[PDB]
Amino acid sequence: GPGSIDDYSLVHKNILHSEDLLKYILETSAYPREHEQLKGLREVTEKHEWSSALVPADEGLFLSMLLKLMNAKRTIEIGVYTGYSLLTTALALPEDGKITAIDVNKSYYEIGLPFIQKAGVEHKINFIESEALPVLDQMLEEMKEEDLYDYAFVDADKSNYANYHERLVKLVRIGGAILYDNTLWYGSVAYPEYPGLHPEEEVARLSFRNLNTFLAADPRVEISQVSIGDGVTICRRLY
Amino acid sequence: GPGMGASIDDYSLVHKNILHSEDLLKYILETSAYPREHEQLKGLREVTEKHEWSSALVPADEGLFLSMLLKLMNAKRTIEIGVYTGYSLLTTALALPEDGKITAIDVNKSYYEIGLPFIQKAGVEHKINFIESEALPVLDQMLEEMKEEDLYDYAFVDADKSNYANYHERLVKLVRIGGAILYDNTLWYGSVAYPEYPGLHPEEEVARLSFRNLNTFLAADPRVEISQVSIGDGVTICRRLY
Numbered sequence: 434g435p436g437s438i439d440d441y442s443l444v445h446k447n448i449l450h451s452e453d454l455l456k457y458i459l460e461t462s463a464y465p466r467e468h469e470q471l472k473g474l475r476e477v478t479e480k481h482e483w484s485s486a487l488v489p490a491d492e493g494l495f496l497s498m499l500l501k502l503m504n505a506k507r508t509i510e511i512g513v514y515t516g517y518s519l520l521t522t523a524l525a526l527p528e529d530g531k532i533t534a535i536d537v538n539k540s541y542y543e544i545g546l547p548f549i550q551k552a553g554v555e556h557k558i559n560f561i562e563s564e565a566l567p568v569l570d571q572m573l574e575e576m577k578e579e580d581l582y583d584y585a586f587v588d589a590d591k592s593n594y595a596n597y598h599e600r601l602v603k604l605v606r607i608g609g610a611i612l613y614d615n616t617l618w619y620g621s622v623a624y625p626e627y628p629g630l631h632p633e634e635e636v637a638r639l640s641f642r643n644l645n646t647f648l649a650a651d652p653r654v655e656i657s658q659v660s661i662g663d664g665v666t667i668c669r670r671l672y
Numbered sequence: 673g674p675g676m677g678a679s680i681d682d683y684s685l686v687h688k689n690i691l692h693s694e695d696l697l698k699y700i701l702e703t704s705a706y707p708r709e710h711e712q713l714k715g716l717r718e719v720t721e722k723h724e725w726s727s728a729l730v731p732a733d734e735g736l737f738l739s740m741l742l743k744l745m746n747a748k749r750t751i752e753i754g755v756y757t758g759y760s761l762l763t764t765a766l767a768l769p770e771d772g773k774i775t776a777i778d779v780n781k782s783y784y785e786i787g788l789p790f791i792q793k794a795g796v797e798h799k800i801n802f803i804e805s806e807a808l809p810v811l812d813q814m815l816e817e818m819k820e821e822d823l824y825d826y827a828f829v830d831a832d833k834s835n836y837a838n839y840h841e842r843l844v845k846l847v848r849i850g851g852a853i854l855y856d857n858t859l860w861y862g863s864v865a866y867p868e869y870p871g872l873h874p875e876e877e878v879a880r881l882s883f884r885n886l887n888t889f890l891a892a893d894p895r896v897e898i899s900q901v902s903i904g905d906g907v908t909i910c911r912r913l914y
Protein backbone atom coordinates (compact mmCIF):
# COMPACT_ATOMS: atom_id res chain seq x y z
CA GLY A 434 0.00 0.00 0.00
CA PRO A 435 0.96 3.67 0.36
CA GLY A 436 4.08 4.07 2.47
CA SER A 437 2.08 -0.28 -5.86
CA ILE A 438 -1.10 1.26 -7.26
CA ASP A 439 -0.74 -0.72 -10.50
CA ASP A 440 -1.98 -3.85 -8.71
CA TYR A 441 -5.05 -2.42 -6.93
CA SER A 442 -8.61 -2.82 -8.20
CA LEU A 443 -11.08 -0.71 -6.19
CA VAL A 444 -9.39 2.70 -6.55
CA HIS A 445 -11.92 4.06 -9.08
CA LYS A 446 -15.11 2.74 -7.44
CA ASN A 447 -17.71 5.08 -5.96
CA ILE A 448 -20.15 4.46 -3.15
CA LEU A 449 -22.56 7.08 -4.52
CA HIS A 450 -24.79 6.04 -7.40
CA SER A 451 -23.05 8.19 -10.05
CA GLU A 452 -19.97 10.30 -10.73
CA ASP A 453 -22.26 13.23 -11.51
CA LEU A 454 -23.71 13.17 -7.99
CA LEU A 455 -20.28 13.17 -6.34
CA LYS A 456 -19.16 15.90 -8.75
CA TYR A 457 -22.21 17.96 -7.77
CA ILE A 458 -21.43 17.73 -4.05
CA LEU A 459 -17.77 18.67 -4.57
CA GLU A 460 -18.44 21.57 -6.94
CA THR A 461 -21.46 22.94 -5.06
CA SER A 462 -20.55 22.45 -1.40
CA ALA A 463 -16.91 21.36 -1.05
CA TYR A 464 -14.58 23.29 -3.37
CA PRO A 465 -16.20 26.72 -2.66
CA ARG A 466 -15.45 26.16 1.05
CA GLU A 467 -12.00 24.58 0.62
CA HIS A 468 -9.06 26.59 1.96
CA GLU A 469 -6.70 27.75 -0.77
CA GLN A 470 -3.83 25.77 0.74
CA LEU A 471 -6.00 22.65 0.94
CA LYS A 472 -6.75 23.11 -2.76
CA GLY A 473 -3.04 23.38 -3.53
CA LEU A 474 -2.23 20.34 -1.39
CA ARG A 475 -5.01 18.34 -3.04
CA GLU A 476 -3.97 19.28 -6.58
CA VAL A 477 -0.32 18.21 -6.25
CA THR A 478 -1.46 15.04 -4.47
CA GLU A 479 -3.82 14.07 -7.30
CA LYS A 480 -0.72 13.74 -9.50
CA HIS A 481 0.96 11.38 -7.02
CA GLU A 482 1.04 7.61 -7.51
CA TRP A 483 -1.01 7.01 -4.35
CA SER A 484 -3.62 9.72 -4.96
CA SER A 485 -6.36 7.11 -4.44
CA ALA A 486 -5.64 7.22 -0.68
CA LEU A 487 -6.35 10.97 -0.57
CA VAL A 488 -9.17 12.04 1.75
CA PRO A 489 -11.78 13.70 -0.51
CA ALA A 490 -12.74 17.34 -0.12
CA ASP A 491 -16.34 16.75 0.98
CA GLU A 492 -15.19 14.43 3.77
CA GLY A 493 -12.55 16.99 4.76
CA LEU A 494 -15.15 19.67 5.42
CA PHE A 495 -17.08 17.05 7.40
CA LEU A 496 -14.03 16.45 9.60
CA SER A 497 -13.54 20.19 10.13
CA MET A 498 -17.21 20.58 11.05
CA LEU A 499 -16.94 17.83 13.67
CA LEU A 500 -13.79 19.41 15.12
CA LYS A 501 -15.33 22.87 15.48
CA LEU A 502 -18.68 21.64 16.81
CA MET A 503 -16.97 19.69 19.60
CA ASN A 504 -14.47 22.52 20.31
CA ALA A 505 -11.49 20.21 19.81
CA LYS A 506 -8.12 21.51 21.02
CA ARG A 507 -5.69 18.55 21.15
CA THR A 508 -5.92 15.87 18.45
CA ILE A 509 -3.93 12.96 17.03
CA GLU A 510 -3.68 12.10 13.33
CA ILE A 511 -2.70 8.53 12.42
CA GLY A 512 -1.89 8.21 8.73
CA VAL A 513 -0.85 11.54 7.26
CA TYR A 514 0.22 10.88 3.63
CA THR A 515 0.56 14.33 2.00
CA GLY A 516 -1.43 15.90 4.84
CA TYR A 517 -4.89 16.81 3.55
CA SER A 518 -6.81 15.66 6.64
CA LEU A 519 -3.93 16.91 8.80
CA LEU A 520 -4.11 20.39 7.27
CA THR A 521 -7.90 20.22 7.60
CA THR A 522 -7.53 19.53 11.33
CA ALA A 523 -4.89 22.24 11.83
CA LEU A 524 -7.02 24.89 10.13
CA ALA A 525 -10.06 23.97 12.24
CA LEU A 526 -8.26 24.03 15.60
CA PRO A 527 -7.78 27.35 17.46
CA GLU A 528 -4.49 29.23 17.23
CA ASP A 529 -3.04 27.31 20.21
CA GLY A 530 -4.27 23.86 19.20
CA LYS A 531 -1.93 20.88 19.06
CA ILE A 532 -1.80 17.84 16.78
CA THR A 533 0.27 14.68 17.10
CA ALA A 534 0.71 13.46 13.51
CA ILE A 535 2.10 9.96 12.93
CA ASP A 536 3.16 8.32 9.67
CA VAL A 537 5.89 5.89 8.63
CA ASN A 538 6.73 8.05 5.58
CA LYS A 539 7.75 11.65 6.24
CA SER A 540 8.59 12.21 2.56
CA TYR A 541 4.85 12.08 1.84
CA TYR A 542 4.30 14.73 4.52
CA GLU A 543 6.95 16.96 2.93
CA ILE A 544 4.91 17.03 -0.30
CA GLY A 545 2.15 18.93 1.50
CA LEU A 546 4.32 20.67 4.09
CA PRO A 547 4.80 23.86 1.98
CA PHE A 548 1.01 24.28 1.89
CA ILE A 549 0.75 23.63 5.64
CA GLN A 550 3.39 26.31 6.22
CA LYS A 551 1.70 28.86 3.95
CA ALA A 552 -1.53 28.32 5.89
CA GLY A 553 0.36 29.30 9.06
CA VAL A 554 -0.56 26.20 11.06
CA GLU A 555 2.66 24.16 11.00
CA HIS A 556 3.43 25.18 14.59
CA LYS A 557 0.42 23.18 15.82
CA ILE A 558 1.84 19.94 14.37
CA ASN A 559 4.22 17.52 16.09
CA PHE A 560 5.07 15.08 13.30
CA ILE A 561 6.48 11.69 14.32
CA GLU A 562 7.95 9.50 11.57
CA SER A 563 7.29 6.00 12.91
CA GLU A 564 4.85 3.13 12.88
CA ALA A 565 1.78 4.16 14.85
CA LEU A 566 1.48 1.28 17.30
CA PRO A 567 4.79 1.75 19.18
CA VAL A 568 4.00 5.47 19.40
CA LEU A 569 0.55 4.77 20.84
CA ASP A 570 2.00 2.22 23.28
CA GLN A 571 4.62 4.74 24.40
CA MET A 572 1.83 7.27 24.93
CA LEU A 573 -0.25 4.84 27.01
CA GLU A 574 2.43 4.74 29.73
CA GLU A 575 3.23 8.48 29.62
CA MET A 576 -0.30 9.81 29.10
CA LYS A 577 -2.04 11.36 32.10
CA GLU A 578 -5.71 12.32 32.16
CA GLU A 579 -4.89 16.03 31.83
CA ASP A 580 -3.49 15.43 28.32
CA LEU A 581 -6.07 13.07 26.80
CA TYR A 582 -6.94 13.86 23.20
CA ASP A 583 -10.25 15.33 22.08
CA TYR A 584 -10.18 13.74 18.63
CA ALA A 585 -8.42 10.95 16.74
CA PHE A 586 -8.42 10.35 12.99
CA VAL A 587 -7.32 6.81 12.08
CA ASP A 588 -6.25 6.43 8.45
CA ALA A 589 -3.06 4.33 8.40
CA ASP A 590 -2.57 0.55 7.89
CA LYS A 591 -6.06 -0.80 7.24
CA SER A 592 -5.35 -4.25 8.71
CA ASN A 593 -4.28 -2.65 12.02
CA TYR A 594 -7.36 -0.57 12.91
CA ALA A 595 -8.46 -2.97 15.66
CA ASN A 596 -5.03 -2.71 17.28
CA TYR A 597 -5.22 1.09 17.05
CA HIS A 598 -8.68 0.96 18.65
CA GLU A 599 -7.53 -0.76 21.84
CA ARG A 600 -5.01 2.04 22.42
CA LEU A 601 -7.17 5.00 21.41
CA VAL A 602 -10.13 4.12 23.66
CA LYS A 603 -7.75 5.10 26.49
CA LEU A 604 -5.85 7.94 24.77
CA VAL A 605 -8.97 9.98 23.88
CA ARG A 606 -10.96 11.67 26.64
CA ILE A 607 -14.42 10.56 27.71
CA GLY A 608 -16.76 12.17 25.21
CA GLY A 609 -13.95 12.47 22.67
CA ALA A 610 -14.17 11.19 19.12
CA ILE A 611 -12.28 8.40 17.35
CA LEU A 612 -12.82 8.38 13.58
CA TYR A 613 -11.92 5.44 11.33
CA ASP A 614 -11.49 6.10 7.62
CA ASN A 615 -12.40 3.76 4.73
CA THR A 616 -14.71 1.58 6.84
CA LEU A 617 -16.85 0.83 3.77
CA TRP A 618 -13.79 0.04 1.59
CA TYR A 619 -15.31 1.17 -1.72
CA GLY A 620 -18.45 -0.82 -0.87
CA SER A 621 -16.57 -4.13 -1.03
CA VAL A 622 -17.43 -4.90 2.62
CA ALA A 623 -21.13 -5.38 1.79
CA TYR A 624 -20.58 -9.02 0.72
CA PRO A 625 -18.94 -12.08 2.30
CA GLU A 626 -16.94 -12.59 -0.91
CA TYR A 627 -15.74 -10.00 -3.42
CA PRO A 628 -13.71 -11.25 -6.41
CA GLY A 629 -11.04 -9.40 -8.32
CA LEU A 630 -9.08 -7.78 -5.48
CA HIS A 631 -5.39 -7.44 -4.84
CA PRO A 632 -4.29 -9.61 -1.88
CA GLU A 633 -3.68 -6.48 0.21
CA GLU A 634 -7.12 -5.14 -0.73
CA GLU A 635 -8.73 -8.40 0.40
CA VAL A 636 -6.86 -8.30 3.71
CA ALA A 637 -8.15 -4.76 4.27
CA ARG A 638 -11.66 -5.77 3.18
CA LEU A 639 -11.81 -8.62 5.70
CA SER A 640 -10.26 -6.37 8.35
CA PHE A 641 -13.02 -3.79 7.91
CA ARG A 642 -15.83 -6.36 7.94
CA ASN A 643 -14.46 -7.61 11.27
CA LEU A 644 -13.90 -4.08 12.57
CA ASN A 645 -17.39 -2.86 11.65
CA THR A 646 -18.93 -5.81 13.49
CA PHE A 647 -16.65 -5.23 16.49
CA LEU A 648 -17.29 -1.49 16.75
CA ALA A 649 -21.05 -2.07 16.59
CA ALA A 650 -20.73 -4.40 19.60
CA ASP A 651 -18.13 -2.42 21.59
CA PRO A 652 -19.86 -1.09 24.73
CA ARG A 653 -16.99 1.31 25.48
CA VAL A 654 -18.11 3.59 22.61
CA GLU A 655 -21.15 4.83 20.76
CA ILE A 656 -20.75 4.68 17.00
CA SER A 657 -22.17 6.11 13.79
CA GLN A 658 -21.02 4.83 10.39
CA VAL A 659 -21.36 7.64 7.84
CA SER A 660 -21.67 6.98 4.11
CA ILE A 661 -19.27 9.83 3.25
CA GLY A 662 -16.08 9.49 1.23
CA ASP A 663 -15.14 5.83 1.59
CA GLY A 664 -17.11 5.44 4.81
CA VAL A 665 -16.24 7.06 8.14
CA THR A 666 -17.10 5.47 11.49
CA ILE A 667 -17.32 8.01 14.32
CA CYS A 668 -16.89 6.54 17.80
CA ARG A 669 -17.41 8.52 21.01
CA ARG A 670 -15.81 7.23 24.21
CA LEU A 671 -18.47 6.50 26.83
CA TYR A 672 -16.31 5.71 29.86
CA GLY B 673 -46.52 15.90 0.73
CA PRO B 674 -47.14 14.36 4.16
CA GLY B 675 -48.07 17.73 5.65
CA MET B 676 -50.35 18.90 2.84
CA GLY B 677 -50.77 18.70 -0.91
CA ALA B 678 -50.33 15.82 -3.31
CA SER B 679 -50.76 12.09 -2.79
CA ILE B 680 -47.90 9.65 -2.35
CA ASP B 681 -49.11 8.20 -5.67
CA ASP B 682 -47.66 11.18 -7.55
CA TYR B 683 -44.17 10.97 -6.00
CA SER B 684 -41.53 9.36 -8.21
CA LEU B 685 -38.25 9.52 -6.23
CA VAL B 686 -39.27 7.54 -3.14
CA HIS B 687 -37.64 4.24 -4.14
CA LYS B 688 -34.24 5.69 -5.10
CA ASN B 689 -31.09 5.97 -2.99
CA ILE B 690 -27.93 8.03 -3.32
CA LEU B 691 -25.67 5.04 -2.61
CA HIS B 692 -24.54 2.81 -5.45
CA SER B 693 -26.48 -0.24 -4.23
CA GLU B 694 -29.23 -1.25 -1.84
CA ASP B 695 -26.88 -4.03 -0.69
CA LEU B 696 -24.41 -1.45 0.62
CA LEU B 697 -27.21 0.42 2.40
CA LYS B 698 -28.56 -2.84 3.81
CA TYR B 699 -25.07 -3.69 5.08
CA ILE B 700 -24.74 -0.33 6.84
CA LEU B 701 -28.15 -0.66 8.48
CA GLU B 702 -27.77 -4.30 9.54
CA THR B 703 -24.15 -3.97 10.69
CA SER B 704 -23.97 -0.45 12.11
CA ALA B 705 -27.49 0.98 12.64
CA TYR B 706 -29.98 -1.62 13.88
CA PRO B 707 -27.62 -3.11 16.54
CA ARG B 708 -27.32 0.42 17.98
CA GLU B 709 -30.97 1.41 17.55
CA HIS B 710 -32.93 2.03 20.75
CA GLU B 711 -35.75 -0.46 21.29
CA GLN B 712 -38.36 2.31 21.10
CA LEU B 713 -36.79 3.74 17.94
CA LYS B 714 -37.08 0.27 16.40
CA GLY B 715 -40.74 0.09 17.39
CA LEU B 716 -41.40 3.61 16.12
CA ARG B 717 -39.71 2.80 12.80
CA GLU B 718 -41.56 -0.49 12.30
CA VAL B 719 -45.02 1.06 12.66
CA THR B 720 -43.94 4.02 10.50
CA GLU B 721 -42.79 1.68 7.72
CA LYS B 722 -46.46 0.71 7.26
CA HIS B 723 -47.65 4.33 7.09
CA GLU B 724 -48.54 5.86 3.73
CA TRP B 725 -45.71 8.41 4.07
CA SER B 726 -43.02 5.92 5.08
CA SER B 727 -40.69 7.48 2.49
CA ALA B 728 -40.37 10.66 4.59
CA LEU B 729 -38.93 8.74 7.55
CA VAL B 730 -35.37 9.56 8.64
CA PRO B 731 -33.36 6.33 8.21
CA ALA B 732 -31.64 4.54 11.07
CA ASP B 733 -28.06 5.20 9.95
CA GLU B 734 -28.75 8.94 9.68
CA GLY B 735 -30.48 8.83 13.07
CA LEU B 736 -27.31 7.63 14.79
CA PHE B 737 -25.44 10.36 12.91
CA LEU B 738 -27.76 13.05 14.29
CA SER B 739 -27.40 11.54 17.77
CA MET B 740 -23.60 11.55 17.51
CA LEU B 741 -23.53 15.24 16.53
CA LEU B 742 -25.79 16.16 19.46
CA LYS B 743 -23.52 14.46 21.99
CA LEU B 744 -20.19 15.60 20.53
CA MET B 745 -21.37 19.23 20.68
CA ASN B 746 -23.01 18.78 24.13
CA ALA B 747 -26.35 20.12 22.91
CA LYS B 748 -29.01 20.91 25.51
CA ARG B 749 -31.71 23.06 23.88
CA THR B 750 -32.77 22.04 20.37
CA ILE B 751 -35.57 22.77 17.91
CA GLU B 752 -37.07 20.09 15.64
CA ILE B 753 -38.90 21.33 12.53
CA GLY B 754 -40.82 18.53 10.83
CA VAL B 755 -41.67 15.76 13.28
CA TYR B 756 -43.87 13.23 11.40
CA THR B 757 -43.99 10.10 13.62
CA GLY B 758 -41.05 11.39 15.66
CA TYR B 759 -38.05 9.20 14.80
CA SER B 760 -35.63 12.13 14.61
CA LEU B 761 -37.40 13.71 17.59
CA LEU B 762 -37.01 10.57 19.72
CA THR B 763 -33.39 10.27 18.59
CA THR B 764 -32.75 13.81 19.82
CA ALA B 765 -34.59 13.31 23.12
CA LEU B 766 -32.59 10.14 23.82
CA ALA B 767 -29.28 11.84 23.00
CA LEU B 768 -29.82 14.97 25.10
CA PRO B 769 -29.15 15.04 28.85
CA GLU B 770 -32.14 14.47 31.09
CA ASP B 771 -32.52 18.24 31.57
CA GLY B 772 -32.48 18.80 27.81
CA LYS B 773 -35.42 20.55 26.18
CA ILE B 774 -36.76 20.29 22.62
CA THR B 775 -39.17 22.53 20.75
CA ALA B 776 -40.88 20.30 18.17
CA ILE B 777 -43.02 21.87 15.44
CA ASP B 778 -45.23 20.03 12.96
CA VAL B 779 -48.44 20.90 11.12
CA ASN B 780 -49.89 17.44 11.87
CA LYS B 781 -49.98 16.26 15.49
CA SER B 782 -51.78 13.06 14.43
CA TYR B 783 -48.49 11.86 12.95
CA TYR B 784 -46.73 12.71 16.21
CA GLU B 785 -49.26 10.74 18.26
CA ILE B 786 -48.34 7.62 16.26
CA GLY B 787 -44.84 7.68 17.76
CA LEU B 788 -45.80 9.23 21.10
CA PRO B 789 -46.30 5.81 22.81
CA PHE B 790 -42.69 4.92 21.99
CA ILE B 791 -41.42 8.31 23.17
CA GLN B 792 -43.31 7.81 26.44
CA LYS B 793 -42.02 4.25 26.88
CA ALA B 794 -38.51 5.67 26.41
CA GLY B 795 -39.19 8.08 29.27
CA VAL B 796 -38.15 11.27 27.46
CA GLU B 797 -41.48 12.95 26.73
CA HIS B 798 -40.78 15.46 29.51
CA LYS B 799 -38.09 16.95 27.25
CA ILE B 800 -40.52 17.64 24.37
CA ASN B 801 -42.69 20.72 23.90
CA PHE B 802 -44.68 19.88 20.77
CA ILE B 803 -46.28 22.74 18.82
CA GLU B 804 -48.93 21.91 16.21
CA SER B 805 -48.67 24.73 13.66
CA GLU B 806 -46.90 25.80 10.51
CA ALA B 807 -43.23 26.31 11.30
CA LEU B 808 -42.67 29.86 10.04
CA PRO B 809 -45.21 31.67 12.30
CA VAL B 810 -43.71 29.84 15.29
CA LEU B 811 -40.17 30.81 14.26
CA ASP B 812 -41.18 34.44 13.73
CA GLN B 813 -42.84 34.63 17.14
CA MET B 814 -39.71 33.11 18.70
CA LEU B 815 -37.42 35.81 17.29
CA GLU B 816 -39.51 38.47 19.02
CA GLU B 817 -39.41 36.56 22.33
CA MET B 818 -35.95 34.98 22.22
CA LYS B 819 -33.36 36.05 24.76
CA GLU B 820 -29.74 35.55 23.75
CA GLU B 821 -29.38 33.37 26.86
CA ASP B 822 -32.13 31.13 25.44
CA LEU B 823 -30.66 30.55 21.96
CA TYR B 824 -30.83 27.00 20.62
CA ASP B 825 -27.78 24.76 20.30
CA TYR B 826 -29.11 22.63 17.46
CA ALA B 827 -31.80 22.76 14.77
CA PHE B 828 -33.03 19.92 12.55
CA VAL B 829 -34.99 21.06 9.49
CA ASP B 830 -37.10 18.39 7.81
CA ALA B 831 -40.47 20.03 7.04
CA ASP B 832 -41.76 21.35 3.67
CA LYS B 833 -38.80 21.07 1.29
CA SER B 834 -39.78 24.09 -0.82
CA ASN B 835 -39.55 26.40 2.23
CA TYR B 836 -36.04 25.68 3.58
CA ALA B 837 -34.67 29.09 2.55
CA ASN B 838 -37.31 30.91 4.60
CA TYR B 839 -36.55 28.67 7.58
CA HIS B 840 -32.85 29.49 7.19
CA GLU B 841 -33.29 33.26 7.58
CA ARG B 842 -34.98 32.68 10.95
CA LEU B 843 -32.72 29.93 12.30
CA VAL B 844 -29.43 31.79 11.73
CA LYS B 845 -30.71 34.13 14.46
CA LEU B 846 -32.41 31.50 16.65
CA VAL B 847 -29.38 29.19 17.03
CA ARG B 848 -26.40 30.34 19.10
CA ILE B 849 -23.04 31.26 17.62
CA GLY B 850 -21.25 27.98 17.08
CA GLY B 851 -24.56 26.12 17.10
CA ALA B 852 -25.72 23.73 14.40
CA ILE B 853 -28.49 23.95 11.80
CA LEU B 854 -29.09 20.70 9.90
CA TYR B 855 -31.06 20.53 6.65
CA ASP B 856 -32.39 17.14 5.59
CA ASN B 857 -32.80 15.86 2.01
CA THR B 858 -30.42 18.40 0.45
CA LEU B 859 -29.49 15.83 -2.22
CA TRP B 860 -33.14 14.92 -3.01
CA TYR B 861 -32.44 11.39 -4.27
CA GLY B 862 -29.61 12.63 -6.48
CA SER B 863 -32.01 14.68 -8.61
CA VAL B 864 -30.29 17.95 -7.61
CA ALA B 865 -27.18 16.93 -9.56
CA TYR B 866 -28.61 18.10 -12.89
CA PRO B 867 -30.15 21.43 -13.95
CA GLU B 868 -33.10 19.59 -15.52
CA TYR B 869 -34.56 16.25 -14.40
CA PRO B 870 -37.35 14.35 -16.19
CA GLY B 871 -40.78 13.26 -15.09
CA LEU B 872 -41.23 14.73 -11.61
CA HIS B 873 -44.54 15.76 -10.07
CA PRO B 874 -44.73 19.54 -9.43
CA GLU B 875 -44.24 19.12 -5.66
CA GLU B 876 -41.14 16.98 -6.20
CA GLU B 877 -39.80 19.24 -8.96
CA VAL B 878 -40.30 22.41 -6.90
CA ALA B 879 -38.48 20.78 -3.99
CA ARG B 880 -35.66 19.76 -6.34
CA LEU B 881 -35.32 23.32 -7.66
CA SER B 882 -35.51 24.64 -4.09
CA PHE B 883 -32.67 22.38 -2.91
CA ARG B 884 -30.46 23.35 -5.86
CA ASN B 885 -30.93 27.02 -4.95
CA LEU B 886 -30.44 26.32 -1.24
CA ASN B 887 -27.23 24.32 -1.71
CA THR B 888 -25.75 27.14 -3.80
CA PHE B 889 -26.97 29.75 -1.30
CA LEU B 890 -25.63 27.96 1.78
CA ALA B 891 -22.21 27.52 0.15
CA ALA B 892 -22.05 31.31 -0.32
CA ASP B 893 -23.55 32.29 3.06
CA PRO B 894 -20.85 33.99 5.17
CA ARG B 895 -23.00 33.68 8.31
CA VAL B 896 -22.24 29.93 8.51
CA GLU B 897 -19.72 27.24 7.70
CA ILE B 898 -21.27 24.27 5.93
CA SER B 899 -20.72 20.55 5.39
CA GLN B 900 -22.91 18.60 2.97
CA VAL B 901 -22.86 14.93 4.02
CA SER B 902 -23.91 12.10 1.70
CA ILE B 903 -25.86 10.24 4.39
CA GLY B 904 -29.53 9.34 4.14
CA ASP B 905 -30.83 11.67 1.43
CA GLY B 906 -28.13 14.27 2.04
CA VAL B 907 -27.73 16.34 5.21
CA THR B 908 -26.16 19.81 5.20
CA ILE B 909 -24.68 20.84 8.55
CA CYS B 910 -24.32 24.60 9.08
CA ARG B 911 -22.46 26.12 12.04
CA ARG B 912 -23.31 29.74 12.81
CA LEU B 913 -20.27 32.03 12.71
CA TYR B 914 -21.81 35.32 13.86
Ligand SMILES: Nc1ncnc2c1ncn2[C@@H]1O[C@H](CSCC[C@H](N)C(=O)O)[C@@H](O)[C@H]1O
Nearest residue numbers: 436487488512514518536537564565589590
Ligand atom coordinates in the same frame (compact mmCIF):
# COMPACT_ATOMS: atom_id res chain seq x y z
N1 LIG C 1 1.94 1.16 10.37
C1 LIG C 1 1.76 2.44 10.06
N2 LIG C 1 1.96 3.42 11.02
C2 LIG C 1 1.78 4.75 10.70
N3 LIG C 1 1.41 5.10 9.42
C3 LIG C 1 1.21 4.15 8.48
C4 LIG C 1 1.39 2.80 8.78
N4 LIG C 1 1.13 2.09 7.66
C5 LIG C 1 0.79 2.95 6.66
N5 LIG C 1 0.84 4.22 7.16
C6 LIG C 1 0.56 5.49 6.46
O1 LIG C 1 -0.83 5.74 6.38
C7 LIG C 1 -1.09 6.57 5.27
C8 LIG C 1 -2.42 6.17 4.62
S1 LIG C 1 -2.95 7.31 3.33
C9 LIG C 1 -3.73 8.42 4.53
C10 LIG C 1 -4.33 9.64 3.83
C11 LIG C 1 -4.42 10.92 4.67
N6 LIG C 1 -5.10 10.66 5.93
C12 LIG C 1 -5.10 12.01 3.86
O2 LIG C 1 -5.63 12.98 4.41
O3 LIG C 1 -5.13 11.97 2.62
C13 LIG C 1 0.08 6.42 4.32
O4 LIG C 1 0.69 7.68 4.13
C14 LIG C 1 1.06 5.50 5.02
O5 LIG C 1 2.37 5.99 4.93
Ligand SMILES: Nc1ncnc2c1ncn2[C@@H]1O[C@H](CSCC[C@H](N)C(=O)O)[C@@H](O)[C@H]1O
Nearest residue numbers: 675728729730754756760778779806807831
Ligand atom coordinates in the same frame (compact mmCIF):
# COMPACT_ATOMS: atom_id res chain seq x y z
N1 LIG D 1 -45.11 24.20 6.93
C1 LIG D 1 -44.86 23.24 7.82
N2 LIG D 1 -44.64 23.56 9.14
C2 LIG D 1 -44.38 22.57 10.06
N3 LIG D 1 -44.34 21.25 9.66
C3 LIG D 1 -44.56 20.92 8.36
C4 LIG D 1 -44.82 21.91 7.42
N4 LIG D 1 -45.00 21.30 6.22
C5 LIG D 1 -44.85 19.96 6.39
N5 LIG D 1 -44.58 19.72 7.71
C6 LIG D 1 -44.34 18.42 8.36
O1 LIG D 1 -43.00 18.00 8.19
C7 LIG D 1 -42.94 16.58 8.21
C8 LIG D 1 -41.95 16.09 7.16
S1 LIG D 1 -41.58 14.33 7.30
C9 LIG D 1 -40.32 14.62 8.57
C10 LIG D 1 -39.74 13.29 9.05
C11 LIG D 1 -39.24 13.26 10.49
N6 LIG D 1 -38.36 14.40 10.77
C12 LIG D 1 -38.54 11.92 10.76
O2 LIG D 1 -37.68 11.81 11.63
O3 LIG D 1 -38.84 10.92 10.11
C13 LIG D 1 -44.35 16.07 7.93
O4 LIG D 1 -44.80 15.32 9.03
C14 LIG D 1 -45.20 17.31 7.78
O5 LIG D 1 -46.41 17.18 8.50
Ligand SMILES: O=Cc1ccc(O)c(O)c1
Nearest residue numbers: 673674727728830857905
Ligand atom coordinates in the same frame (compact mmCIF):
# COMPACT_ATOMS: atom_id res chain seq x y z
O1 LIG E 1 -41.94 14.68 1.58
C1 LIG E 1 -41.32 13.74 1.21
C2 LIG E 1 -40.02 13.37 1.92
C3 LIG E 1 -39.20 12.38 1.40
C4 LIG E 1 -38.02 12.05 2.05
C5 LIG E 1 -37.66 12.70 3.22
O2 LIG E 1 -36.47 12.36 3.87
C6 LIG E 1 -38.48 13.68 3.74
O3 LIG E 1 -38.12 14.34 4.93
C7 LIG E 1 -39.66 14.02 3.09
Ligand SMILES: [Mg+2]
Nearest residue numbers: 486588614615
Ligand atom coordinates in the same frame (compact mmCIF):
# COMPACT_ATOMS: atom_id res chain seq x y z
MG1 LIG F 1 -8.17 6.84 4.08
Ligand SMILES: [Mg+2]
Nearest residue numbers: 728830856857
Ligand atom coordinates in the same frame (compact mmCIF):
# COMPACT_ATOMS: atom_id res chain seq x y z
MG1 LIG G 1 -36.19 13.98 5.65
